[PDB]
Amino acid sequence: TAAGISLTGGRNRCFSEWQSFMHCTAKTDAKSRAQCLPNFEDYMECLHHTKEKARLREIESVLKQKKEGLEAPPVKVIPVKAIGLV
Amino acid sequence: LWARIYLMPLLQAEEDRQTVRRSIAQLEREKEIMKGTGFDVDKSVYNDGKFHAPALMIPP
Amino acid sequence: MLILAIISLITFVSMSKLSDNRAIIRLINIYLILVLVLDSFLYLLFLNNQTYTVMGELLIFNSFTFYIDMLIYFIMIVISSLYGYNLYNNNLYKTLFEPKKELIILFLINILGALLIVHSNDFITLFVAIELQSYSIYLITAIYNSSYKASKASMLYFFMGGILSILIAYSINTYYSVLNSYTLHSLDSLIINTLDLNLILIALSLGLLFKIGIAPLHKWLISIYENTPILITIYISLIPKISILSYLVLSNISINSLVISILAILTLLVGSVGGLLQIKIKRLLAFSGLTNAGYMMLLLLLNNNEFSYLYYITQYSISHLAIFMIIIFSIYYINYINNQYNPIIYVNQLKGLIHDNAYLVLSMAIVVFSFIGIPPLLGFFGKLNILMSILNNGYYFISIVLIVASLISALYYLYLLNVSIQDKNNILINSNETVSSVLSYILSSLIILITFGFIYNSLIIDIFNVYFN
Amino acid sequence: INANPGFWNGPFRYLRWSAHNRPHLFFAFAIGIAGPVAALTLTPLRRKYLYPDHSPLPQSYPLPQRAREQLTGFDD
Amino acid sequence: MFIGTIILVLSFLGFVFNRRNIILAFICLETMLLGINLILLRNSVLFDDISGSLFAIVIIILAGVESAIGLSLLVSYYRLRGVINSYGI
Amino acid sequence: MMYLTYYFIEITIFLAILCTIFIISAKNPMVSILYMIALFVIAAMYLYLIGLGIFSLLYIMIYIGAIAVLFLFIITLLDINSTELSVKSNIRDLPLVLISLIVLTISGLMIYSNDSILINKLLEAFGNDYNTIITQDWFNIENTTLLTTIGNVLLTNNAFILLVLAIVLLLGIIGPISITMKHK
Amino acid sequence: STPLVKTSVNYSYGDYPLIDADPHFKRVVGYMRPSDYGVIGLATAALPAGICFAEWLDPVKGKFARPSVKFLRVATMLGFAVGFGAAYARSSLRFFGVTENAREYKKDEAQMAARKAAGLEPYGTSSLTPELQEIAAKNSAHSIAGLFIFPWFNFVNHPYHGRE
Amino acid sequence: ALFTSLVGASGLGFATKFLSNKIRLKPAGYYPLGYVFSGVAWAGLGLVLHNVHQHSLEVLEKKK
Amino acid sequence: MNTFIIFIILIPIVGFALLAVNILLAVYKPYNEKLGAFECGLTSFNQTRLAFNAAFILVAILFLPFDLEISTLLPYVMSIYLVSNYGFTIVLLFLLILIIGFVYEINTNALKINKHNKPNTDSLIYKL
Amino acid sequence: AIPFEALLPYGIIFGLLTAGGGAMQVLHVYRNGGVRDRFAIDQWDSQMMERDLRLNGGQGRKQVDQATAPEAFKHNHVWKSERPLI
Numbered sequence A: 001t002a003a004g005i006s007l008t009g010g011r012n013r014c015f016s017e018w019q020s021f022m023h024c025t026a027k028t029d030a031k032s033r034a035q036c037l038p039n040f041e042d043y044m045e046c047l048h049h050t051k052e053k054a055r056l057r058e059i060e061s062v063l064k065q066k067k068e069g070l071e072a073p074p075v076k077v078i079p080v081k082a083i084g085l086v
Numbered sequence B: 001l002w003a004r005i006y007l008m009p010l011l012q013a014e015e016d017r018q019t020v021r022r023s024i025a026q027l028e029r030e031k032e033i034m035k036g037t038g039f040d041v042d043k044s045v046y047n048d049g050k051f052h053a054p055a056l057m058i059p060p
Numbered sequence C: 001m002l003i004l005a006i007i008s009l010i011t012f013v014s015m016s017k018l019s020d021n022r023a024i025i026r027l028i029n030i031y032l033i034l035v036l037v038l039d040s041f042l043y044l045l046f047l048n049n050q051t052y053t054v055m056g057e058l059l060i061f062n063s064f065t066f067y068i069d070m071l072i073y074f075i076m077i078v079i080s081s082l083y084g085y086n087l088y089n090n091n092l093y094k095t096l097f098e099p100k101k102e103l104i105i106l107f108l109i110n111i112l113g114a115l116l117i118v119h120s121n122d123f124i125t126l127f128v129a130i131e132l133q134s135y136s137i138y139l140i141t142a143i144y145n146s147s148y149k150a151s152k153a154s155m156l157y158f159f160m161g162g163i164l165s166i167l168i169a170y171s172i173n174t175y176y177s178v179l180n181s182y183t184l185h186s187l188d189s190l191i192i193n194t195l196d197l198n199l200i201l202i203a204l205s206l207g208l209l210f211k212i213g214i215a216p217l218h219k220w221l222i223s224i225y226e227n228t229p230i231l232i233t234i235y236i237s238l239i240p241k242i243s244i245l246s247y248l249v250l251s252n253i254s255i256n257s258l259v260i261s262i263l264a265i266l267t268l269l270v271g272s273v274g275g276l277l278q279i280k281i282k283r284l285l286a287f288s289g290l291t292n293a294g295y296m297m298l299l300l301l302l303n304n305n306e307f308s309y310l311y312y313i314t315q316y317s318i319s320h321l322a323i324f325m326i327i328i329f330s331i332y333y334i335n336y337i338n339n340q341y342n343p344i345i346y347v348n349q350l351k352g353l354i355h356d357n358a359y360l361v362l363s364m365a366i367v368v369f370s371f372i373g374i375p376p377l378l379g380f381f382g383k384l385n386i387l388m389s390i391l392n393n394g395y396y397f398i399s400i401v402l403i404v405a406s407l408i409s410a411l412y413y414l415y416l417l418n419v420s421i422q423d424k425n426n427i428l429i430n431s432n433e434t435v436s437s438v439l440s441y442i443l444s445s446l447i448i449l450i451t452f453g454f455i456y457n458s459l460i461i462d463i464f465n466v467y468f469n
Numbered sequence D: 001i002n003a004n005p006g007f008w009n010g011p012f013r014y015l016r017w018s019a020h021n022r023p024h025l026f027f028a029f030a031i032g033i034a035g036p037v038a039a040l041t042l043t044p045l046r047r048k049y050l051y052p053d054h055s056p057l058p059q060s061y062p063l064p065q066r067a068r069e070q071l072t073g074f075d076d
Numbered sequence E: 001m002f003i004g005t006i007i008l009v010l011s012f013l014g015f016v017f018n019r020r021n022i023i024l025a026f027i028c029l030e031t032m033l034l035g036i037n038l039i040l041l042r043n044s045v046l047f048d049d050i051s052g053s054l055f056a057i058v059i060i061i062l063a064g065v066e067s068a069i070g071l072s073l074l075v076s077y078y079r080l081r082g083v084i085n086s087y088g089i
Numbered sequence F: 001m002m003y004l005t006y007y008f009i010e011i012t013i014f015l016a017i018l019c020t021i022f023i024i025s026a027k028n029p030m031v032s033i034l035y036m037i038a039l040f041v042i043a044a045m046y047l048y049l050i051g052l053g054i055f056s057l058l059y060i061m062i063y064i065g066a067i068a069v070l071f072l073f074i075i076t077l078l079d080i081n082s083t084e085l086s087v088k089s090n091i092r093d094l095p096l097v098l099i100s101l102i103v104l105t106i107s108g109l110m111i112y113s114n115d116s117i118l119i120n121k122l123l124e125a126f127g128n129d130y131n132t133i134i135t136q137d138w139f140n141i142e143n144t145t146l147l148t149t150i151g152n153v154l155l156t157n158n159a160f161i162l163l164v165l166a167i168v169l170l171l172g173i174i175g176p177i178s179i180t181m182k183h184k
Numbered sequence G: 001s002t003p004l005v006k007t008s009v010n011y012s013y014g015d016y017p018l019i020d021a022d023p024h025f026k027r028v029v030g031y032m033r034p035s036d037y038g039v040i041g042l043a044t045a046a047l048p049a050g051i052c053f054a055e056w057l058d059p060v061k062g063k064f065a066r067p068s069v070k071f072l073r074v075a076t077m078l079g080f081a082v083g084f085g086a087a088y089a090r091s092s093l094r095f096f097g098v099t100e101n102a103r104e105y106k107k108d109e110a111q112m113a114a115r116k117a118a119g120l121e122p123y124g125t126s127s128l129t130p131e132l133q134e135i136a137a138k139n140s141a142h143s144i145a146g147l148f149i150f151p152w153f154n155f156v157n158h159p160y161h162g163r164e
Numbered sequence H: 001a002l003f004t005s006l007v008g009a010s011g012l013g014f015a016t017k018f019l020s021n022k023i024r025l026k027p028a029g030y031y032p033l034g035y036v037f038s039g040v041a042w043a044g045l046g047l048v049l050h051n052v053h054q055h056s057l058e059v060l061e062k063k064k
Numbered sequence I: 001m002n003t004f005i006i007f008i009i010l011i012p013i014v015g016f017a018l019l020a021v022n023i024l025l026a027v028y029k030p031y032n033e034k035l036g037a038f039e040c041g042l043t044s045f046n047q048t049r050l051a052f053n054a055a056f057i058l059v060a061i062l063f064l065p066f067d068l069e070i071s072t073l074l075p076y077v078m079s080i081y082l083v084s085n086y087g088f089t090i091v092l093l094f095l096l097i098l099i100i101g102f103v104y105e106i107n108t109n110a111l112k113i114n115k116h117n118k119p120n121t122d123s124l125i126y127k128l
Numbered sequence J: 001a002i003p004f005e006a007l008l009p010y011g012i013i014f015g016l017l018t019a020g021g022g023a024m025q026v027l028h029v030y031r032n033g034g035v036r037d038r039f040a041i042d043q044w045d046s047q048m049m050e051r052d053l054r055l056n057g058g059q060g061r062k063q064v065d066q067a068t069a070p071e072a073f074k075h076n077h078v079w080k081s082e083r084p085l086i
């Protein structure tokens, strides 16, 4: 089996969540198995980023509904040629 | 390979320092955008307590 | 043993002349028998239902898979006897039944594909095995390329099986896209509760099930069965059905599925009713196969299906082999040979078979009544076990539909016996040539199993309780 | 004239016949089988007399199999 | 995954509603397999997981063998008839 | 740059749609084979864009270099009859084509979601309005690429699959010979 | 020779104690009993005997003729193959503690004690890295269950033998 | 009883030989040695089944 | 915009430019006799497709499995050190299996075009 | 004798390839700022060259061997924002 192996032969992007969920399933039984629901949730989150996309949708909706200015250290986009300039 | 092994810790330490800095920065930015609204910006989307640098930014 | 036989056969057949064909088949026949009797003891590994993952978790071996492998070996032995042994030694029978040079290799490769499907623990194993079996079966359908019907059938098989292979591949890749996994072992009760896999798993089930021809996608396979040479039809209508059904039984990915319930009902109705107006023997037997596939499809709706599935598939395989052998034996007594690939075509050509060979008709009667389900023949106990399973799990309407389909299909089963026990005007007095001793003994052994196997029912259940619990 | 004398009748005569009359196949086969046979029969001899196998290369950071020591130096 | 999905669906519709020639059926099979492989490879990239790419490689090899056998079947079918009808099957 | 180079993936998608339509509508089946070759070049373009240029090269090597060549070889040697696309023959399919298009496309986008509600299932399909953050680390010291990793897992973790594939290729030799050659 | 993964310890495959969960090919052959060699000889005889007896029952060409020597030779080789497979499986099942294994258990105890006296690894030194040893063990362990389908053997000196 | 199992299985073999003689349109006692061979073979199968069943019962009892 | 992409764009441009120059500068005077296919100066009748030999089909069909066999060794040569001795054994087994198929092809004489007409070797016998 | 007119076209080909390669080498070195090209660079080398750009002020492959980084190195870190692979 190639499960857990990344494109470079190491551990794939979501290996940690999957391994913690597998630890959970190994320690519990069929009756207790639902106790492992959070771990599996985290695993699926890593796979698909669904809650993260929802949270970003919420933040962006509130952002585009604001005319007041933002005063925080910002993000700046630069050309690849300008990596390290100035 | 052993030369790269001996350089790995300092490069990863620098990168970890940057990961922390930018993650905390993004949390501060988002909580400032969400000020005045009923939404927790500090609540993780994961259930474990572990540090999770963001994937998935808003396009700049 | 199988891989070794395939390698050795390719070399040996390459260095052999076309006249050695039957001899070569005989050799492989005895080889298979030896493997069955010297390697049987390995059943001990599975005492108390011990399961083994093998090949880096690509393969799964348990008592269920070991039994299916033994059954497939037995079927291959029986079918290869029909190519290695002449029914009669006259010129007509040389023309009717001559094995092709590469047919034995194609059979052994197809058997390998089937056994790999049965043991598949990962989806990549499943897909490679499915394509191995599919490609082999296309080539088996085509290898009698002087026949127009066989070549057309092979093309139809290639295209429909390709579309269904694509459906299976797409199912597997959607499963991977949802779970980042290729194994059903990663499914838990918690995962099944948390996620909706039903559409993916039913898509996989349907892709597999349409490949053995359940309704409403039954006509294409029935056409292929009609249009192949009869000794090819005996093989290709049985082995894929066993392999695919066994995999689905062991996987249990469609429990209490509404869609599978509806398709099983439709399959029972189509198989029973659509067999009624058939006048060709192979089309009649193909509709019988469809109905028995619906019976076995019902077992995909429940857990703890192993005993009833294994019993049903075993007795059905025995009966299918017996009825095809009887039809082959009756060729000697018919007036009109339709062509060299299908010497007998119409049920009416069996008219008055009792006056030519009474005990052949007794064998036919036993097999037909087993298909109907008369006790104490094996078919009755197969149907009884299936009814116990489905009523234990609340499938009441389906049990009624099962009863109705059984009654309806009895009509076309009795058609064979009915014409076979009527009178014919010119009956056989004597003939100097006797049919082969080997094939007659094999047919008689099958008949005796169908007749007296029930005597071992309680002993069989006792053994099953220690190897499957 | 020359014709296949049958391998099973006599092995060495058939091998001679092949080397004389089917050199392409004969030497393709000789070269092909030389490899695995040489591997099985010669690699232990090379290990015993010529040189042993080399020490493995690291594939990742070699993590100590131990507990963290308390250490001192370069502090804040 | 859009490009693979569209390729697969359109190739399937072309196969089904083909009423023109048998080569179109062969082509639609090949391109349905291509679409499936594209979907799989995108998921393999997004998970950083070698299993998808391994399956894609196997799919490529099997598509080659399936092409070889399908065209052998077509040639054997041609041998008896000398032509392929626009219903040639 | 940016405008074109941002929508390269979308351009490949549009070109793929067009190429499939041209495959199905071609008058000459040889022209259909050529449009299939075009579709495979487009697929190689997409695979390069998502980071799999090795699969781009493999697809060019195998599907164009081998499979399309066999396609053309066969259509050259064989006598094929074909009819042209026409209203008389094909407008009768338009209702079923439309219903099937909508149903199959929507379902193929919905099979990926994990939401209970069907409309949410379909909505998640069009839900990537966000950029992925690409980050660096220093844990990989070897020069291991996709091809090397495939070799590593195929020859060790999944060696059985390689040997079974060897049997499948054996079939791809023995079968064609069995049905295209007449012995004796 | 240090295992990378946790294995079960002295697990019961049958009614007898475990000797070796994935015995090396050399040990499986070396521990064979004279009865296993009788099996090999029986299969080597049985396959050509079967081909001749089949000829007798129902001649391929009407008149009985002894099968030619090419078929007898192929039958002898394939019969030896079946016999060796059966003998290998019988010895293996003794190593799993599925059949009776007292003689083998004693002999393994003596052999391991001698090697420990000699300072050697109980299961030998491998030319493979431990990761490849693990993959090899997970490819060969219990592969004898697939004897009907394919042959697979343990040729690797790995540490994953299921003992203490 | 093992002896009764052997008699019954040998009778199954006798029935097989008889039916094969009849299907070949031959008299019941056509090649009487075949009755012995068939009976012996089917008795062997019956013996194998009997031994496997006995072992199964032994196992079921030893877990008590 | 590295040299690779610029060069790859530039090649077809030059081909098209040469084609355009030829179209622009050469005369173009088609007429019926010039438009005939050149077959040694004569005209032949249109014919049903020639019946071909099976070896012609077989070379092209067998190219694909052998090509796939060869190309499946690319992952091995790119991973030889990593898989060293285990993978070396595995790749040997894979090669041997494919060589059995090569043996089948060679012994069946699958790519040989047999000259159908052969000299008659029958003796001349006279009934005296 | 050696036929020199038959060698003239070979000489033209040899001279063209030689001069083109020498010119290409000079152009590559000039593009590199006075050093030879890098070849067969893996992901590690790619990241190292990006870090070099952050340290030397965007001056291509210029190297600096001073123990301590400048202040700007703390704040010219780049993450990449990759468009959704649809």
Ligand SMILES: CCCCC/C=C/C/C=C\CCCCCCCC(=O)O[C@H](COC(=O)CCCCCCCCCCCCCCC)COP(=O)([O-])OCC[N+](C)(C)C
Binding pocket: C036, C037, C038, C040, C041, C043, C063, C066, C067, C070, C071, C074, C306, C307, C310, C311, C314, C315, C378, C449, C452, C453, C454, C456, C460, C463, C464, C467, H009, H012, H042, H045, H046, H048, H049, H052
């Ligand atoms: C000396 C070597 C001869 C062995 C060769 C066997 C070849 C099998 C060929 C064809 C299959 C026919 C049916 C197999 C019998 C099942 C045995 C069993 O009890 O099945 C059980 C599982 O029950 C089931 O699921 C239900 C099975 C449904 C059977 C339905 C047919 C009943 C009628 C048969 C009457 C018996 C005739 C006896 C004649 C005196 C598995 O038993 P097991 O896995 O522990 O293996 C047995 C130990 N063995 C390997 C040494 C033999």
